[PDB]
Amino acid sequence: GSMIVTQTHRAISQVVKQAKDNSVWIKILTYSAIDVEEFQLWLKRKNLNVSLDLIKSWCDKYGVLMKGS
């Protein structure tokens, strides 16, 4: 684990949980797979720029299923 990497991972969680659009959180809470590329764009629209690597590692660490994986 890295303290600084987890700060960016925390920002992704905060967007998921704080966005008016709760559809991503509802997918996670119902064990429905997320399209990582679509998610990256969704995050970008919420003022959050993150890489696909950051998203994949976030999903792996916090229990989010990825389409194709």
Binding site: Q14, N22, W25, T30
Partner: protein
């Protein structure tokens, strides 16, 4: 139907958590219940939590009896 944590109405088209024990049947928004179960700000998916009505400690999945069917 009223969410038992935020007191807003739960629409007919909306997914909702319920305690799987009929003797309790605590009903609430998925996001509301999940938020009440989370222990740290980076987390998005509850593992387990205590039903606030009956006090049983159950895994997240147990609250999803109506979500998939």
């Amino acid at each position: 139907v009223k969410c038992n944590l935020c007191y807003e109405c739960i629409e007919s088209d909306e997914l909702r958590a319920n305690c799987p024990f009929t003797d309790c049947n605590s009903i609430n928004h998925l996001t509301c219940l999940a938020s009440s179960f989370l222990t740290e700000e980076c987390q998005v998916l509850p593992i387990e939590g205590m039903c606030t009505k009956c006090k049983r400690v159950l895994r997240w999945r147990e609250f999803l009896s109506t979500v998939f069917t």
